[PDB]
Amino acid sequence: MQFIDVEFPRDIAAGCQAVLTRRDEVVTLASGREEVNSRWADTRRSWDAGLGVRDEADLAQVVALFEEVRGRLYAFRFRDWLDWRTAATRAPITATDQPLGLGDGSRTAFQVVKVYGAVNPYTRPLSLPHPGTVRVALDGVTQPSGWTLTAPGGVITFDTPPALGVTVTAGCSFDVPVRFSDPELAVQWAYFREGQAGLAQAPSIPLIEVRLDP
Amino acid sequence: MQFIDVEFPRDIAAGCQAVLTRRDEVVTLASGREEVNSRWADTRRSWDAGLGVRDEADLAQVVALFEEVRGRLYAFRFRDWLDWRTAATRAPITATDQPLGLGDGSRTAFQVVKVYGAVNPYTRPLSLPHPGTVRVALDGVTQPSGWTLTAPGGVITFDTPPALGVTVTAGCSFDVPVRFSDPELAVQWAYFREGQAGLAQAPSIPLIEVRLDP
Amino acid sequence: MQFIDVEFPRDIAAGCQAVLTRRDEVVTLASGREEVNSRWADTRRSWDAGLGVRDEADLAQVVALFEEVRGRLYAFRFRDWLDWRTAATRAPITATDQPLGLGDGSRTAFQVVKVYGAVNPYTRPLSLPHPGTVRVALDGVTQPSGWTLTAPGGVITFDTPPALGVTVTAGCSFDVPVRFSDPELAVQWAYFREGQAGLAQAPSIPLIEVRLDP
Amino acid sequence: MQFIDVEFPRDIAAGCQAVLTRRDEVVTLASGREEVNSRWADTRRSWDAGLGVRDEADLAQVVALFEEVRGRLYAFRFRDWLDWRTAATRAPITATDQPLGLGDGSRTAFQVVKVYGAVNPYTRPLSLPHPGTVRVALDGVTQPSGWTLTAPGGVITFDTPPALGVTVTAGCSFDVPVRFSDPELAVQWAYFREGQAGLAQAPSIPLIEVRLDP
Amino acid sequence: MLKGKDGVVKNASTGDSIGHLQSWALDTQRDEVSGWGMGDDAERAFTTVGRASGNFEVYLDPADPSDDLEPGDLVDLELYPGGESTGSGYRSVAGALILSTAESASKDGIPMLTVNWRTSGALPQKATVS
Amino acid sequence: MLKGKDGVVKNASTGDSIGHLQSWALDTQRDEVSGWGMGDDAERAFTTVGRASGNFEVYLDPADPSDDLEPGDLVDLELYPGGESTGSGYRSVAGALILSTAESASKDGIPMLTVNWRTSGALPQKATVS
Amino acid sequence: MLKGKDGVVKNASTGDSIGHLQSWALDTQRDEVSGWGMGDDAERAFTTVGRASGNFEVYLDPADPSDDLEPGDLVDLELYPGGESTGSGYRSVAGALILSTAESASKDGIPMLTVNWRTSGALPQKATVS
Amino acid sequence: MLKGKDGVVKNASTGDSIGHLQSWALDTQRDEVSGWGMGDDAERAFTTVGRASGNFEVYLDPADPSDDLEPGDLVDLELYPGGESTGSGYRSVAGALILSTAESASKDGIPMLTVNWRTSGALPQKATVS
Amino acid sequence: MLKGKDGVVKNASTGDSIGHLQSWALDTQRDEVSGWGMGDDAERAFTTVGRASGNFEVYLDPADPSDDLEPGDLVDLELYPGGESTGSGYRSVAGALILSTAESASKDGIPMLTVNWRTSGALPQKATVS
C-alpha cells in the first residue's frame, strides 16, 4: 500500500540490536529424512531498540514517534546499519557495488535488489532507497538523468529502456521498512529535575524488519 | 542425493561445541534384564556453531552462506577437525592409518569408513572425503591411481578389483553433511560505526550432522 | 546372559561421580503409618562420568568405547574405587577381609559376596572379580589351587567341597557391571590445532551400576 | 470469642517483617472501566518472624510458644511496633494523640480506635490495649477513674456517660491479635555443643494480623 | 592555600572547637552516569547525586568535645579552614552523622581519637566567615 | 619534553587559571574487545569507546576559581602542558564534568584542593596554541 | 644483557623512533588450562591461545611521533632492545593497537606521555637486526 | 643453607644453563580440603591435588638459551639450588610449561627476562646431584 | 617476652629441630557469628570453630629435616618458643598438615625453605616444658 515513511533516528539505532530471522525449514520424519518446506519470501530481521536514546529528551522524541504511528500504522522507516552499506563498513558503497540487473531493451524498471550469497543468492528488493546514496550505473558509463526513481517503490525507471548488453548497477543505503513487534514499550528514563539523571538505554522495544506486502 | 555443496569455513568452525546422541535403548523390566532395541540413526552429532566470526563483515559472509542455503536446501557441508585426521590431531593422517578392508578379487568399490571402536566398532561412512588428502594403499604398494573416488559418494572404485586377501588401506580428511536444526539464525555482530566493533563470535547456531536416510 | 566385559578406564573413572541408589520404600498413610514395600534386589549405584578424560585423545577413546557397545550392549565393566577395596582405601584388601561363607561339605561354589552393614547386612554378589586380586582362604589356611573361579560368574568352585567348620574368606577388587543411564553423551573437548587445548572433563555421561539378571 | 492472649516476645518481634495487606478491589472491564468491590473489614498486616531469636534457648522458647497454641488456637498476642505508638517512634504516645470520639451523654463505651488517613480515614478498633499505656482524656481534663477498660474488648466504659461536647481522646500501645499463616515452621538453630553455635535468624515463620470476628 | 594551622574544626552545635586536632578532611563527591549508544565514540555523562563525607583527627582526652561526640550522632560541623578571621572561607556542615570513633594508642603513642562524619541528606556549604 | 612549570591549566569557559596548581593529569582511554579464537593463536583488538578522565591539583583558597568549580560542574578546560607560550601543544578539553573535590589538610599542611573531572561524551582536542 | 640505552622503541610505521623514551616494556603471555580427574596427584596443563602486550614511556612533546599516535591506533612497532646495530635482537610488533595514552605532569615535572600497546591478532616476532 | 651464587638453573632437556640468571623460584603447592560439622569443634584437613609453579629471572640477551625459551614451551628443568657441586639438593623439574616471558627495560635499565613456568601435571624431584 | 633465639621449631615426629630457622609463626583463630534482631542496638556474637595455622622459615639444605618434610605431610610439631629450658612455654602441634614449601633464592641469596602448616582436626596445646 502507500504505507508511512517515518524516520528512526540513527543514534537510537546505534543502541539497537540485530538478529536474523529465517524460515522455510519444516523437515520430515527424524529418521534422517528431510523435506524442505517453503514459507516463501522470508529473511526478515529482528531487532530490539531504545538503547541508543542517551538522554530523556531524546527518549521522549522516540516515544512521541511511536505514538505518532499509534501502534505501527502501516510502515515505519528504519535505518539499518548492516544494509546501509552495499560494500563494507569501512568501504564506500558504489553504484557498481550492487548489480541491479541487465537491461534487455524493454527493461525500463529495476528494483534495487540486494543479492546475498553467491551460488544460490537470495535477492532482497529494497522498499526505500536512502535519498542521495542512489547512484545508477550502466556498463558503458555511470548513468545520470532519465532514470526515474520511485522512492516508495524502490524501482528506478529508465525513460529509454537500456538495450541488451548494458549492466545496470546501483548501490544505495537501505532505509528498511520496520513494524514494531510489541505495542508495549518499557520506559527507562531516570528521573530528572532535582535528580538530573536521564537514561542512555530503554529496554524492550522490539521491532521486526517487515517485508511489506505491495 | 547430490545435495548442495557449501563448505562451512574452518575459521567459522573454530570454537564450536558438539553433542553425541545415540538412538538405541528401549530397555525392559526392573528385574535387571534389559533389552536393547535399536531403530538405527544412532550417534548423530549436534553442533552449536558460529564461533570465531571475529568481525561483522566476516559474520556477514557466514550470514550470506545461510542465505545461500535458504533454509538448508538439500544438505550443507561441514568440516570437522576431529574426524579430519584418520589418526590423531598431532599425528599425520596416512593411507595406512585407516584400513578400508580386504579385496576378494571382485571388490572394486570400498567405502571410506571410520571405525569407532575395537571389539564392535560402529562404522561411520564418510559421505564426503576431502580431496587431495585421499591416499590409497594396496597391500602390495601404495596406489597412485585407478581408484575412482566419488566425491559425493564417498566410494573409491578400483578399476581393477583388488585380489583375494589383499588389504586396502585408505586415509583421508573427513567432510560431513550437516543440516541446520533451526531456521532462525541468532546474530552477535557488535555494532560498528562510531563505536567500532565486530563480534568475535556469533551465538551458537544449531546445525546437526545428519546421517541421511537412504 | 553372557553379557560383555569392557573395561572403563580408571583415569576416566577418577572424574566419575558416586551416588547411592536404594529402593523398597512406598510407605502407607502419612498419619505416621508406615508400610515397607519391597522392590527386591536393590542398592544400585548412580554415577556420572567423563570428567576424568584429561585430553582430546583420551576423550576420543572413551567415545569410541561407547560406540563399541553401540548403546550399552549387554554389560559394561566399570572400575569402582569404592567397591574395589574390601578393606579400606588406606588398608590392603585380603582374602580374610571379606567372608564368603562356610563350607558345609557339599558347598563347592561360593559367589564373592560383599556384606554391607552388620546386624542385618545386605550382601552383594560380585559379577566380576578383578583378576589377580582374588585370593581364597580357608579357616585352616589360605586356599590356593582347586578353586575354580568363574570370572563372569563371580563364583569360586572348590573341586573338593570344603568340609563343615572351615570358613571360606575371599577378598577381591570389584569390577562392577555398569549400563549407561543415557544414550546421549555431551562432548567437551576444547579445540586443538593452533589452539592446542583439549579437555580434562566431559559432562553428562551418566551410568547406573547394573545388577544384571543372570 | 474469648480467644487466647499469648505474648510474642518483643526481641523476636524486633526481627520481624511487615507488609500491608489490603483488599476490596475487584475492578471491571479493562476498557478503563473500574468497579470497586467491597470485601469489608480489611487492612490486615502480614509478617514473617524468627529473625529476632538471637540464640538457641530463645528459639526454643518461641517454638514452645507455638506449641502452646497447638497451631494458633484462637488468638495470639503480637506486639506491633508500628501500631504501638499512636504518635511517632520518636514522639511519646498520649491520650490526646488518638481521638476515641465524642461522648453524647449516652456514650458509655468507646473502643480504642486508630484512625489512619484524614479525609476518608479508616478506623481500626484495637482488641488489646497494651496495659499501662492506656490513658483516657476528656476535653475538660485527662480522665482518670470511672472508665472501665475491657482489656480483651478494647472498650473503655465510663460509668457516667460523658455529656455532649467533651472529646474522648485515648492513646495506647497496640497489642495486636495475630494468627500464624502457616503451621509449618522452619528451624535454623545451628548445632551447639562442641560447635557452640546457635542462630539469630530462624526463617519462614509466617503470621497474619488477624481481625478476629467477635 | 591558607596555613592549615588556622584551620580548625569547630563543632557548630557545641559552639566550640572539638579539640587539639591533628588533621581535617572534607570531600565532596557528585557521581555521574555515563551512557552511550553502541555506535558511539564517547559516552555522555550526567551527574546524579551529591553526597559528602569528612574525617577529623583529634587527640583523645576525657575533657574533649570530640570525646563527648559519639558514633551515630548527627551533629552539625563548622570546619574553618581559613579560621575565624575576616574573609575566611569556611565549610558549614549540617547534620553530619558520625560514622565511627577510633580510640587507639601505643605505649609510646598519645591516645588518638579519629572521628569520621558523613553529612546526612545535606551538602556542606562553603560559606565565608567575615 | 616540555617544562610544565610554565604550564597553565586554565578554564576554556572562564578563560582563567584555576589557581596555584601542583599537578595536571589527562588520560585518554579507549576500550577494546578481544577477538578470541579457539583453534586460533591470537586475538584481534577492536576499540569501541574513548573517554577522558583527569585530575588537576590545586591549593584550596577562598578566593580561587578552583573553589568556584564545584563537583558536578560541566566546564570546558584549556589545558596547556607547555603553558601559554606559543607553539606548546595544548589540550582543549571540552565539557569536562567535575566529579569530586577533596579539601583536606593537616594542621601543618596547607589546604589542598583535588579536583577530578571526567568527560561528558566529548573528547579533548590536542591543538597547538598559536 | 643489553645496555638498554641502546634499546629504542621505533614506530615501524613512522620509520622513526617515537621519541625521548623513558622506558620500554614487552610481555608475552600464553594462557593455559589445567585439569585433573578427581583423585589425581597433579593437574595436567596444556597451553591455550597466546597474546601479548607492551608499554612504552615517552616525554610528551608537540613534535613527537608518540604525540601523533592516538589511542585506538593499530600501529606496527619496532622495539630495538639491542638497538639497530648488527646482530642485535629486536622485537617487531605488527598492528599493535594503542590501548591508551596518558599525558600528565606536575609543575616540577616535565610532561610525560605514557603509551600502551597490545598487538592485535599477532604475536611479536623476536627478529634479529643485522 | 647453600650459597646460591654457584647455583645453576639449567635446562634438563637442553642440558645447559638458561643465561645470566638473577633469581630462581620453586614452590610446590598442595591444596587441602577442610571439613567441620556444627557438632564438631575442629576442621579436619586432607590434602588433595599438588601443583608446582616457578619463575626464573634472567638477563635478556639475543644470544640466550632463555631467549630461545618461549611461553608455551614444555621443557624440563635441571635446577640446582646449590649448583652443580655434588650432593647439593637439586630439583629435577619435569615438563615445566613456560607460561610467560617479560622483557622490560628503562633506558638506564638492563633488559631483563622474567620467565614464569607452571607444571604440566608432573612433580619436580628433589634429587641430589651426584 | 622471651628471646626468640631460644624459640626453636622442633619436629615432634622426628624428635629434632627442622634446621637453621629464620622465623617461627603460630596463629590461633576462633571464628564467631554475630546476629541481631532488626530492632537491635548491637549484635550478639557467639564463637564457633577453632582452627590454627603456622609458618616456619628455614634455610634450604640437602641435609635438613625440613627438606625431608613435604607438602601434604601431616606431621606433628613441637614449637619451643621458650626453648627446652625448664618452665618454658611451648606449643605442641598435633598432625599439622604441611600445605606448601617454597624453595627460592637469588644468586646473592641463600636458598630458602619456607614451610607452612595448618594443624588438621586439632588445636596446638600450649604446654609448658620443664
Automatic annotation (TrEMBL), chains A, B, C, D:
Domain of life: Viruses
Name assigned to this protein: Tail protein
Annotated source species: Dinoroseobacter phage vB_DshS-R4C
UniProtKB/TrEMBL annotation, chains E, F, G, H, I:
Protein name, entry field: Major tail protein
Domain of life: Viruses
